[PDB]
Amino acid sequence: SFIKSLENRRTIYALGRNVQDEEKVIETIKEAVRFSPTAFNSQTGRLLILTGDAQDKLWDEIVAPELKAAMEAAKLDGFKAAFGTILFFEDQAVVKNLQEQFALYADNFPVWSEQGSGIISVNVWTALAELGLGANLQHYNPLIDEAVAKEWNLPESWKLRGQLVFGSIEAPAGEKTFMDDADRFIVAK
Amino acid sequence: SFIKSLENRRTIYALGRNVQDEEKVIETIKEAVRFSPTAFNSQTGRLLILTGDAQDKLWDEIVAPELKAAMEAAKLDGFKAAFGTILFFEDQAVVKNLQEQFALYADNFPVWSEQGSGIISVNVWTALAELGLGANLQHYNPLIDEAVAKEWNLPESWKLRGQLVFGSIEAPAGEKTFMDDADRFIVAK
Ligand SMILES: Cc1cc2nc3c(=O)[nH]c(=O)nc-3n(C[C@H](O)[C@H](O)[C@H](O)COP(=O)(O)O)c2cc1C
Numbered sequence A, B: 001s002f003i004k005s006l007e008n009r010r011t012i013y014a015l016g017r018n019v020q021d022e023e024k025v026i027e028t029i030k031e032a033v034r035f036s037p038t039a040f041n042s043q044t045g046r047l048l049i050l051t052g053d054a055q056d057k058l059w060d061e062i063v064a065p066e067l068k069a070a071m072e073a074a075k076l077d078g079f080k081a082a083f084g085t086i087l088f089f090e091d092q093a094v095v096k097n098l099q100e101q102f103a104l105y106a107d108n109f110p111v112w113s114e115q116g117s118g119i120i121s122v123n124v125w126t127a128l129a130e131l132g133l134g135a136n137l138q139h140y141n142p143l144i145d146e147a148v149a150k151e152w153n154l155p156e157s158w159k160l161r162g163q164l165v166f167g168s169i170e171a172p173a174g175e176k177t178f179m180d181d182a183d184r185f186i187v188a189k
């Protein structure tokens, strides 16, 4: 059931490293992005997938110091304790090329790219949940962008949009409420 | 298989009205939105679901004339021929309230709302594909926004983002290529 798969995806903050088949996890991350739609099949999403030492480095050597410096002008341990982090970027070189090819609709491509980032982020999140792995989505962009690009030698054109922290589920999702259907769905014949 | 469900979703332009259980279709549309994540559980997505006479009216009485007037300053028959159209909006009143509650991060909420629209659009699209129904995603916003709001008495705060045309599959999806994995995925340990 696709709907059941959607329901199974939740924000899990308590994450560990009890992950049995990392190769299968990577395969599924790639597939979830591969089969996601993007405007004009532009495929603007880019991923940096960090585990092990690189996972430790992101949180200890980049996020923590950047955040401290930012604040001046715990939760991090929880993120570090996870198995890995998937950093989602949108390739601005491709967006700019589309804007150049289709000037009358230049305003659309950044919007559709942003939508595209949401799309691939949740498809990956849901795919991970199907494997029994939890995840949560963070936003320490744009603070960490430069340091991340330098450390992993990323193209300047990759614009960081989100960081999906993932791993084994160590405690259940919290409670979550839903709006009244009547306030968000209108059906007319 | 969640990945298989993703692969099964495609852009289908040749759509008909050979839909067996409209109530089940509506149920699934609602569920796909219900179980989609949004920042702060803000649930900013709003849907207008049109079938039958309302489907005819949208394309014949709103999109066609607006587009003509716009151009001055076929494909439409293909959209009209579908069973229905799901118009996706984002509730700007909720976005503004979040911006007010969290002023330091006011810039984030419009971005996350845009991502949210992508998220619910593709979750609905994929859910429909699981039922064997095809769909395609159009963007005649902002040209049709005012006329749509007036005809179906929608709140001013609903900002139209996309229109998912759906129905029975009358011809297969076209060919689609994929980028080289090496150009969009980096894995580091
Ligand atoms: C676009 C987007 C941005 C989000 N931003 C964050 C964030 O920065 N930090 C965080 O902890 N959760 C974040 N969330 C998680 C949402 O708060 C969560 O998805 C929502 O409360 C629904 O709960 P669920 O994921 O368990 O279904 C984000 C979700 C989405 C879709």
Ligand SMILES: Cc1cc2nc3c(=O)[nH]c(=O)nc-3n(C[C@H](O)[C@H](O)[C@H](O)COP(=O)(O)O)c2cc1C
Residues within 6 Å of the ligand: A036, A037, A038, A039, A040, A041, A042, A112, A113, A115, A116, B009, B010, B011, B012, B118, B136, B137, B138, B139, B173, B176
């Ligand atoms: C954010 C977004 C906007 C899109 N805009 C349009 C559009 O306005 N008109 C259209 O015919 N297709 C549109 N598409 C469809 C894409 O071109 C299509 O998803 C892509 O070529 C991949 O093909 P597939 O949907 O068969 O997998 C859009 C897709 C996405 C995700």
Ligand SMILES: O=C(N[C@H](CO)[C@H](O)c1ccc([N+](=O)[O-])cc1)C(Cl)Cl
Residues within 6 Å of the ligand: A038, A039, A040, A041, A102, A105, A108, B138, B139, B140
């Ligand atoms: O072709 C364009 N717009 C047409 C006009 O109706 C249409 O809206 C459209 C938009 C996106 C698209 N896509 O993502 O493949 C296809 C057609 C421009 Cl965005 Cl270049």
Ligand SMILES: O=C(N[C@H](CO)[C@H](O)c1ccc([N+](=O)[O-])cc1)C(Cl)Cl
Residues within 6 Å of the ligand: A138, A139, A140, B038, B039, B040, B041, B102, B105, B108
């Ligand atoms: O709380 C905020 N930011 C924190 C700071 O780290 C964090 O980025 C966050 C963002 C979104 C979120 N959500 O969508 O529920 C939760 C925490 C503001 Cl956006 Cl109000």
